[PDB]
Amino acid sequence: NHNAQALNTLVKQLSSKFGAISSVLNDILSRLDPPEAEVQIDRLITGRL
Write down the least CB distance from residue 40 to another protein, Å: 13
Write down the least CB distance from residue 34 to another protein, Å: 24
Q: Which of 24, 25, 41, 47 binds another protein (CB under 8 A)?
A: 47
Q: Are 13 and 47 in contact (CB under 8 A)?
A: yes
Of 26, 48, 47, the residue nearest 37 (C-alpha): 26
Q: Note whether 21 binds another protein by CB under 8 A.
A: no
Q: Are 28 and 39 in contact (CB under 8 A)?
A: no
Write down the least CB distance from residue 37 to another protein, Å: 19
